[PDB]
Scaffold this active site. Structure first.
Site, short mmCIF file in Angstrom:
data_model
loop_
_atom_site.label_atom_id
_atom_site.label_comp_id
_atom_site.label_asym_id
_atom_site.label_seq_id
_atom_site.Cartn_x
_atom_site.Cartn_y
_atom_site.Cartn_z
N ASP A 86 68.66 28.18 37.08
CA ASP A 86 68.57 28.01 38.50
C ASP A 86 66.96 27.92 38.65
OD1 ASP A 86 69.08 27.74 41.47
OD2 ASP A 86 67.91 29.93 41.28
N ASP A 88 65.00 27.24 42.29
CA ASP A 88 64.36 27.96 43.58
C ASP A 88 64.63 29.60 43.53
OD1 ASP A 88 63.43 25.51 44.44
OD2 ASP A 88 64.42 25.63 46.21
CA CA Z 1 67.98 29.75 43.54
#
Ligand code: CA
Ligand code: CL
Ligand code: CL
Length: 295
Positions: A86, A88
């Protein structure tokens, strides 16, 4: 099947003292104790016949009050050959969508939606369209502006990706955010590839929409499947890491799935969680020693 427990602290608050590691291993009637990094991480091979749930609770009680994560897994196939991460709040400190919303004077209104989406209270795709529509009219110059002034790398990220690539892994940064951010971030950290959504623009300004079909929770599962098949492996050969509800599909499919500083309802669902360490935790989970790291 042989089992191993790993204890992991944050290198910035390295509280896994020698005496503490000794006491932990005694709590599980362990055979030996192997240090991967002094005051930071150690391996404790469980004796044969112990359920992982026993060792977990035993170690957590012994360590109670200390900022030290616990994970238990099988010793074989610890070291993975695919990373899917991932972006962010995982490899960077920020939510790019919230920082963009600042430039429209709507940070708080958008950040409140983002929190609900990453907790899983709303589906990712309508959450994204609602947030992005508020960006309508922003000049394209705001993307470079946010990247160069407000985006920061998570501690341990570069070391994680580079040490894994050193040992032949394939690394992918896979995000529900935007290609204009992931392409630069992936380059800075050193990923082999990235995949994200796409903001639409008219040549000068953002339209306020996203290219369809939108990549959400299931699209991360699909990219994990596509990658493993392309490199001639299976998702069992992958470690996946995220903080949000949209990462739970890939976290659950990968051989090793890590909820890292996850949202409360997200961590509630993951089998393996890291709440104290930084991204180098994923190196220790895989059995690497500091001597192995790319510095
Ligand atoms: Ca995230
Ligand atoms: Cl974009
Ligand atoms: Cl899980």
């Amino acid at each position: 099947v042989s089992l191993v427990a790993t204890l992991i602290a944050n290198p910035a608050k390295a509280a896994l003292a020698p005496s503490l590691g000794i006491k932990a291993s005694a709590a599980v009637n362990a055979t030996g104790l192997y240090w991967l990094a002094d005051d930071i991480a150690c391996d404790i091979p469980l004796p044969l016949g112990m359920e992982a749930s026993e060792a977990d609770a035993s170690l957590r009680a012994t360590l109670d009050g200390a900022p030290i994560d616990v994970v238990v897994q099988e010793q074989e196939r610890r070291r993975k050959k695919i990373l899917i991460a991932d972006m962010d709040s995982t490899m960077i400190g920020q939510e790019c969508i919230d920082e963009l919303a600042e430039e429209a004077g709507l940070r708080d209104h958008v950040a409140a939606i983002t929190a609900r989406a990453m907790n899983g209270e709303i589906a990712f795709e309508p959450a994204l369209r609602e947030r992005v529509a508020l960006l309508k009219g922003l000049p394209l110059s705001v993307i470079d502006k946010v990247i160069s002034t407000r985006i920061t790398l998570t501690p341990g990220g570069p070391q994680l990706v580079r040490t894994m690539r050193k040992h032949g892994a394939y690394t992918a940064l896979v995000s529900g955010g935007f290609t204009s951010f992931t392409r630069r971030i992936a380059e800075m950290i050193g990923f082999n590839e990235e995949r994200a959504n796409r903001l639409i623009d008219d040549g000068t300004r953002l339209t306020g929409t996203v290219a369809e079909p939108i990549l959400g929770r299931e699209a991360k599962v699909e990219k994990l499947v596509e990658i493993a098949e392309r490199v001639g492996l299976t998702p069992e050969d992958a470690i996946a890491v995220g903080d949000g509800a949209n990462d739970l599909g890939m976290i659950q499919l990968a051989g090793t799935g890590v909820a890292l500083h996850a949202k409360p309802a997200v961590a509630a669902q993951a089998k393996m969680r890291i709440d104290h360490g930084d991204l180098t935790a994923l190196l220790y989970i895989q059995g690497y020693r500091k001597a192995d790291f790319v510095q």
